[PDB]
């Protein structure tokens, strides 16, 4: 946004080598054996010895920070996403379930979709004109770059690694979105010749034409191709665009401001699993016989409007970070509530262009393979949605405790109660205090959290001691969180040192081949907070086979939770985890309320 704002942003720092390594050792203590830790302790000493390996890699990073706007940006984008070859569906792109709407028929479905589209466009005008209010935290400026990467962008498959395209500020910025109904894509202009955007009224009319132009689900679901493994899709994609019309259709989709999915009616399911199924619809589409073919997962922003009133979205992580999504969601959902103005007469509108795909035996075969792969992926995903109604940010705030820290500690307690030990845990920290900053790691399994979880279930530890361990664990998490936001965390730094060595063509440092590092980076618990004003929540699959994916949005008086796991791992169970988490949150509240400070 504002040039002066961005120019005043500090550059991402390179923490002192001794600092990060000391923090690293501290974070390893609760998750590795005494034997593995003592060894890592030795490797760390060797790594930072004067004139040693680590010393040179550090200087390498320091030279890097001097020459680039952000020393970590490209590396992070490349290693975390562009080089990740698993399908983006479930394993990378987060899904979000929004408040269910009240429409009961197709007309209502199109009307809402029309309103949503207008809302996103309204948000876009602020981004285009850079009038989007600049943001701060604790009095310090926050980078606004993330906002200029979510619209008019798309991920592009590559044989070895993928890439991202962004046309928001190209010579001739896109003025159309893409609409997909019954697996058929349409190019819809949402701006009149004079630059003004179409009204919800005008949009509805265009959506009506699109719906009518694709009444049956009688076309191959080419879109489902985007849900396959990245190496597989890269090849199928190359073949797909050999045809001129296909290439043109793909191009229109890639350049579209965003995509809106008008989903088809799905079978009824028992009430107790309804939310779980809707989450599924937003994350992956539910399957080849449902709405998965009504998607283009390479697209950065996909808004989904279900037939039964439900709605949500799925965003591609390479190009989109959490903050901009939250802002867009809160803005759009409010816009959909603002009083619509009196209907001004309507002018003629063109027919939205259908983006056809010429099917061949090769493309058809690729589609069938994609259906099979996605069916396997979905069958292995175990999702449990939990609406914690007992309390929200209100209780923790009444105890002068950070709600996010409180939740993370509860999760640590729940995990320990089930497995009897702690595990590498990941929570995302925002690095927006720095120019082009994305994320760093907050490690929730710590010396203090382990002390608390153990003491909580130890009959020999007096409740008064248990409550003190609880407050220390929460305060310790809060401190880690604040340090990470200030660039004092160590995970991206250690990654940087490793990448620096790779680039310098030196032998992989021992500290990275260390078993302790492998354990440290294998997150059995991968979490994320969605601090939105809108009553919504996100979800994603676990980052490891034997892990859980836990997302939450703390509201004032309740907390929205999603817990995912893979069935292929017999040791994990989403429902069981959600149950323990609920009880953990409750037991922590009970302990605190019965053992207050002093009068």
Curated annotation (Swiss-Prot):
E.C. number: 2.3.1.137, 2.3.1.7
Coiled coil: none
Motif segment (Microbody targeting signal): 598-599
Active site residues of this protein: 317
Entry GO terms, CC: endoplasmic reticulum; mitochondrial inner membrane; mitochondrion; peroxisome
Pfam families assigned to the protein according to its UniProt record, in alphabetical order: Carn_acyltransf (PF00755)
Residues the record lists as N6-succinyllysine modifications: 67, 235
One GO MF term attached to the UniProt entry: carnitine O-octanoyltransferase activity
Chain sites annotated for binding (R)-carnitine: 426, 428, 439
Localization per record: Endoplasmic reticulum; Peroxisome; Mitochondrion inner membrane
Broad class of where this protein is predominantly found: endoplasmic reticulum
Entry-linked InterPro entries: Carn_acyl_trans, CAT-like_dom_sf, Cho/carn_acyl_trans, Cho/carn_acyl_trans_2
Superkingdom field: Eukaryota
Membrane disposition: Peripheral membrane protein
Function of the molecule: Catalyzes the reversible transfer of acyl groups from carnitine to coenzyme A (CoA) and regulates the acyl-CoA/CoA ratio. Also plays a crucial role in the transport of fatty acids for beta-oxidation. Responsible for the synthesis of short- and branched-chain acylcarnitines. Active towards some branched-chain amino acid oxidation pathway (BCAAO) intermediates. Trans-2-enoyl-CoAs and 2-methylacyl-CoAs are poor substrates.
Quaternary structure and interacting proteins, as annotated: Monomer.
Name of the protein in question: Carnitine O-acetyltransferase
Organism, scientific name: Mus musculus (Mouse)
Upper classification of the organism: Eukaryota, Metazoa, Chordata, Craniata, Vertebrata
